[PDB]
């Protein structure tokens, strides 16, 4: 698999700062935001509804959770999405074995604490919970960020 650059990525993001005096791992949005900045893509901003409503805009969509980490195993950045009423998330999807047979792994920081976050070991299906799960979007960026 190709995704070590966006592994990387993810790995050096996890400590940064987006927002002053907020640690991205308490931050979903800013997390994902400079996980693409070292990644050199473009990624709409604000927070997670925001970045929601931009990704549906521009990015093309994944059709499964199985289709999402075949596109981070090719290198590309994919990023998994998902509206609330109040407050949204966002996940930098990775490859690996599927969680249940179906729920990708990924990274991801939080303001909820542990329970929101993580660090590759986690799926998406462990981060949001199990109504939430099987209602996420996972997006795509056109070119492929990992070479050779």
């Not at 002053?20 to 931050?27: E, I, M, R, S």
């Not at 549906?56 to 980490?69: F, P, V």
């Not at 462990?126 to 056109?142: E, I, M």
Request: hydrophobic residues 35%; proline residues 3%.
């Amino acid at each position: 698999s190709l995704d070590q650059c966006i592994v990387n990525a993810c790995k050096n993001s996890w400590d940064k700062s987006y927002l002053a005096g907020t640690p991205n791992k308490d931050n979903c949005s800013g997390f994902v935001q400079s996980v693409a900045a070292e990644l050199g893509v473009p990624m709409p901003r604000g927070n997670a509804n925001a970045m929601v409503d931009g990704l549906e805009q521009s990015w093309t969509k994944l059709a499964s959770g199985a289709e999402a980490a075949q596109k981070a195993a090719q290198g590309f950045l994919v990023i998994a999405g998902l509206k609330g009423r109040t407050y949204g998330h966002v996940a930098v999807v990775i490859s690996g074995p599927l969680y249940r047979q179906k729920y990708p792994m990924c990274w991801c920081g939080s303001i909820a604490g542990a329970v929101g976050q993580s660090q590759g070991l986690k799926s998406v299906g462990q981060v949001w919970n199990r109504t939430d799960r099987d209602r996420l979007n996972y997006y795509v960026y056109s070119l492929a960020s990992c070479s050779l």
